[PDB]
From a paper:
The human PRS family, which has 3 isoforms (hPRS1, hPRS2 and hPRS3), belongs to the class I PRSs that requires divalent metal ions such as Mg2+ as the activator, inorganic phosphate ion for activity, and ATP or dATP as the diphosphoryl donor. Due to the important role of PRPP in the nucleotide metabolic process, the stability of PRPP content is essential for cell physiology and is predominantly controlled by hPRS1, the ubiquitously expressed human PRPP synthetase. Mutations in hPRS1 affect vital cell functions and are related to many diseases and disorders.
Overall, the structures of all the five structures are highly similar to that of the wild type PRS1 with RMSD listed in S2 Table. In the A87T and M115T structures, the mutations of hydrophobic residues decrease the hydrophobic character of both Ala87 and Met115. In the PRS1 structure, Ala87 is located in the hydrophobic core of the N-terminal domain, whereas Met115 is located at the hydrophobic A-B dimer interface. These mutations might disrupt the secondary structure at given sites, and may interfere with the hydrophobic interaction of the secondary structure elements, which stabilize the protein quaternary structure.
Numbering used by the authors:
A (entry chain B), C (entry chain B), E (entry chain B): 3 to 195, 203 to 317
B (entry chain A), D (entry chain A), F (entry chain A): 3 to 195, 203 to 313
The structure:
């Protein structure tokens, strides 16, 4: 009844998830046309199946989004019983508000486009804003890296019982507090004004920078400098989504981090060759379990504060 | 061509809004049946009209929301050209995420109901979350108390050029940092562990607690003590939405608040009498302007 | 697969229905906030379940309606397979038309709000207007008290073979005729102009007043007076929905009824202490069977003219 | 800015409506293909126009409904600003409840089709059920023959101040009681057990059978006998919708009807010739007024 | 779980399909009212069933379409689990475009009306335009006569290895080429300007006229004349839909065809008495299998190029 | 009251369109973030305005489509009165049928996205399929290059009164027969078996290959050889949409094409330099006229 498909050829995560469910990845014939439009062909009857499409890590976001939609489309008109998208890193998630400007809420637009395409259910990890669930009318299971993050912290940072959980921006207040309270440790908060301000004691402690995503890495670098200027022993940075476009690898390789930790919601294998500070958590068991629970009607909640 | 309608009782804000525009509020027959139902009769023809309903303050949010939806409805089936709802304080607005629970996103449910009721356009002020603008597919105009708050602060706090703007929770980091940045002064945050924790420098300076809304004031009155214990010279509390239910009023007088400032997005005339330090910024002109500018095709965002 | 929930704390009817299906009521954490908004929390995974929400008898209709919706909402985004509302007494049902006025069709509005909230199916009893089914696009099973009413009449009114079934208003013509024809007895019809007019013979017979709902009871009282003025032996009044707000208890206790019969679509236990003329039919087996049939795909029709 | 279009053939009512407004009916090319399909060509540009389609009377309701939907459609995709449908007699209108059967609610299906066809606004007369206004989410304006019926009665029944208004079924209680109340006279109801039963006092007075529509007239012609047997001085039958199919016409002449009054919501010019006593109230001015007032933003409800 | 119903009394095809699935046709009470509106009553609980409505061959298209819709409606509000319409010949299918005119896309309108009525899935055969699938948002299985056509051609035309597959119009280019290529034979193309032009060699070969539908038969007749004027041995005409309104029977009986082949997507029994050139392919096994596959989640594709 | 906005870069067509109407293109801030996202800022107030977005030509169709949807969106939530999208060349337009595969109908998916994005009205040119007008429920106006193609042919092919209009596929029968009929000349079709097959008389006459679009030009360059081998005097190729990706440009110069004519529905200024024989019909006036006539309520279809 359950059928999984991948997007494009960045199929590592999808095949990882497949393996763990004891399934092969469903057959697809997906190619860009000479004019840059995307062809998609579903190479096996999905008629009355519980279909799952895992979003690609290609990098190119619009080519990835049209492909994801077109697949959703193909699968619905082919009489799939239900189409879930496993979208580890939700596109345009940083565009969730107008910000006093005459701007689009592209997070919502995308939310609509997934919905018209024929999506029935959404599985994602760590939405940039919690409220992005509210841009949909269908159900959304937003999973957390937070328990595996806690796992990583405890098994890898000797001084985790005496660290500080810092936010690189004001927006990520709740996220860093929540982790600190569970770890029973202090928290601190960097805000940018062309200068950063730090509130909270970090002196003679290990500072851990927690964010949901890092893109160009300009911020976290400037934030690790600040933390080492205010007397932190050493600095870690943990991001659930490792986007790392442009000068990120350069900014990191130079930057005064001990380690940079990301999940494989985005492909890292290529970035890891050129950057020796990047460690990768595998989140495929979390995504696999989510699908598995979903298909059975078992509680996907048990993953919000437990590592399968 | 324009018509302005009010809510249950709570006419003051509306009456004010209709004044600044030089109109009289529209004829309506709102009442409650003996069995808790909400009864509505539109006392004039709204056919082909640009209508504006201003949300009431009966201090009963389900009754008020229902009356609001029943109005939009009567208007939409009486061939009104358009129905904007002026809801300065958006109902169920803190219920905008599951938060790891199996809980409703009620502000989405509410957005969806206003939508299906026939509301074409929304006007509100300081939405608890900015994202509860993406709950709608109809356009929303969200006004800010931010400029009126600033003006007041400068014109009312002698030491402001050395004051600290303080968030009562962690979830209020962005709102305060903004206010602190415009004023070019320090910011500080408080978090409930319970035991309260304060990050930021508040020693020997005027503290200004800033929240979008206070309900019980429990959190903000604690926030005040913690701030005194921290050695704040004088603590102030600014709130855009003053809900003040339960123990709220008494809790304030029992606190050290030099003053408490709110905008009349909710009727305070009752609670003012029971509280001396309360002070109100009048936001009607801002709502009236946004009504005219919407109607005229004039730039609303300027008021931001 | 089947899960039942109640609304608010008026849980008598809901637990009655639960008992009869051999189920416990699903766990909910429901409280009004200090500002009068309603919190709701579903205290157990409903993921892929056939959920049923039975509408509360609290009395306060708007607080009851938001709560019902919010629950519907919580349950849908929590991936319930299907959400049915068992709404014994449909709110705003008397507002089903404009009545030559510039008024809302609040019955339809409510019908829409249930529908956007995420309702998939509706189970109700004795809609004020049959056409209220037409305010929905989803399926609606409108059940009747009429067979149990007939049961009550036959077992409780000795002279039922020689009674008259009277309508308190013109609107309820079809309802009273239908009962009379099945009982093979006469019918009569009261209309209000500030005076009532009666058409149909009632002289030296037992008059039974049949309505779907009574609220303040002003009408039926004035209608029992009329009936006793036109020579009816004694007067009964049977209403499916016992609303009884305001002076109803006072109007009844004084009023010249032999008995007032209501179903427990609305709580009566409190009203029954202060009013000794109120008898209560239990309709929980009818509602239980309806749910039971629904969940199985058995014919809910068999209840329209049979008492389970 | 306004454009009025007609139906299949059945132009009379439309032509009349367009006259009272001083316009010419719009150019169209409505026909039937040899294989029962309905063909439509809008013979002019309706781009940006407030359009009005007046429902035909080919005495084929499925054909007519389809032609109506195909018109609304062609109009909506040819960029017409708005499409009101003038359907004096709403199709499938008695199919507004299951009635304990597993039957369709077809008037809801029909409402839904007009809706999805692109109709923005409805204008109809004496809806069989008032509730079939809540079938739509677009606004509906329902006109009443009630005032034209009354006027006629007073001006045509000598004894009216002592007459009885009689419902042919139980389901017609509300409509007659209303008419009886305005006239301040007696009301009486009939119910088919079959054997007919009469409740109300009709002895030695003029009886007036009032229904919204008659189809076979079977029920109403019986109703007439029962009323004579009851000792009615003279029986009359008023109907807002005169459908008169099957045996209807002959059944009337075979009855004792002093006269039978209908409104030209349906073409009667054919059936009149075969029936002497039939008399028509002309409701075009009422439809024309409601068209102008809708267009102008003028108060339509006054016509109620 | 599976329930089939017919439309009107033209029940031959529906009962043929029923027989083959080993089912009786579901009970319906369907009659036109005196005013020409259609009554429909579903004479047995379809609650939670997989319902199938096969479209009538009455001839009268609007009376057939309202009836089909009303049935769809009745079935949805009666809580059918899913409503499929088996619409062998899709109504208004020739009205799929504006054609440089201020005209309706009545194919789309119909597509919408089926969709609002409550249709969940569509099963049809040989849409006039492939793109008619795109007028729906629900799934559509468009089946082909083409494999059975190929079957008929091979078993009935001795010279099929040396024939020409001709199009009566320009629109039907792709259709005729595809058949010719599979049969490895030549193709030709008639276009109308008040004169027809033929492109492609037909000389001393058997010409087969292939169209999807023939209505009045004016075209194909004038096209068989042309083909015999350009030296074709004998002419066949194969149409999937035999509409044959008006002078068709007369035009055919006179016309120089060897044979006229139609499927029973439309009733033929009556036309066959008066016209001896009409042969009928039975397509009920193709439709039966389609339903059968649909209900099971088996691949309906296997019928696109195979004859069950 | 009108406002015209452009796409990514590809301003030429827009700039031209805004010229012929006497307006300046609207202020926007379109860019790409370093991580492939599309960023948009509407540089002015579109509140209550009839807006027109003209689709870009960055030669990246997913990027371009997304930027287009993000624009429509920003416009719709900034209270613009209406949003027409001028998409001369409709994206994913050949993906309008499954074609016996389990493939997407992407042009329906695309129609659905433009729709849900908030687009109220579409203007396009020579849709690959006429039916991809029924993909929308909002009205579409489809312009034809047909008259500009004809005019050019007559005014550029000396022998045209004895020429043959040739389809490169079987699926192009209707489009060519039409063109051949207006010109009152012969038509001929080609089909790929592969081996190419030609039906129609092209011997000793000028051949004109006519397609709606060419992408690789592979098919059309073969089509050209087959036509020479058939004894065509001079072959021409007219295309309404010149996509010319991959080997296209080189394939043309390597072919015998006397000339290749395209409309600037796509920027050709780059590919022209690399190809001498390419010639462009300027369709801006036709798009500008259709923009004004839409706005004014003026007859657009005349331009057909």
């Amino acid at each position: 009844n359950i059928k999984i498909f991948s997007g494009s050829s960045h199929q590592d995560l999808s095949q990882k998830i497949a393996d763990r469910l004891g399934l092969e990845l469903g057959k697809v014939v997906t190619k860009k046309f000479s004019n840059q439009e995307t062809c998609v062909e579903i190479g096996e009857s999905v008629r009355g199946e519980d279909v799952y499409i895992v979003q690609s890590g290609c990098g190119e976001i619009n080519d990835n989004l049209m492909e994801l939609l077109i697949m959703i489309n193909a699968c619905k008109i082919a009489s799939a019983s239900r189409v879930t998208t496993v979208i580890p890193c939700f596109p345009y998630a940083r565009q969730d508000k107008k910000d006093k400007s005459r701007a689009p809420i592209s997070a919502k637009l995308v939310a609509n486009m997934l919905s018209v395409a024929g999506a029935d259910h959404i599985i994602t990890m760590d939405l940039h804003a919690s409220q992005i669930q509210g841009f949909f009318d269908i159900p959304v299971d937003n999973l957390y890296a937070e328990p595996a993050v806690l796992k990583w912290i405890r098994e890898n940072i000797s001084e985790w019982r005496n660290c500080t959980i810092v936010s690189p921006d004001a927006g990520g207040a709740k996220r860093v507090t929540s982790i600190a309270d569970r770890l029973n440790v202090d928290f601190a908060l960097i805000h940018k004004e062309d200068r950063m301000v730090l509130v909270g004691d970090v002196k003679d402690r290990v500072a851990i920078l927690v964010d949901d995503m890092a893109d160009t890495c300009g911020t976290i670098c400037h934030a690790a400098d600040k933390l080492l200027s205010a007397g932190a022993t050493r600095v870690y940075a943990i991001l659930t989504h490792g986007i790392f476009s442009g000068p990120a690898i350069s900014r990191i390789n130079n930057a005064c981090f001990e380690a940079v930790v990301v999940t494989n919601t985005i492909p890292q294998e290529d970035k890891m060759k050129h950057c020796s500070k990047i460690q990768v958590i595998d989140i495929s068991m979390i995504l696999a379990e989510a699908i598995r629970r979903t298909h059975n009607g078992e509680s996907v909640s048990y993953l919000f504060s437990h590592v399968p």
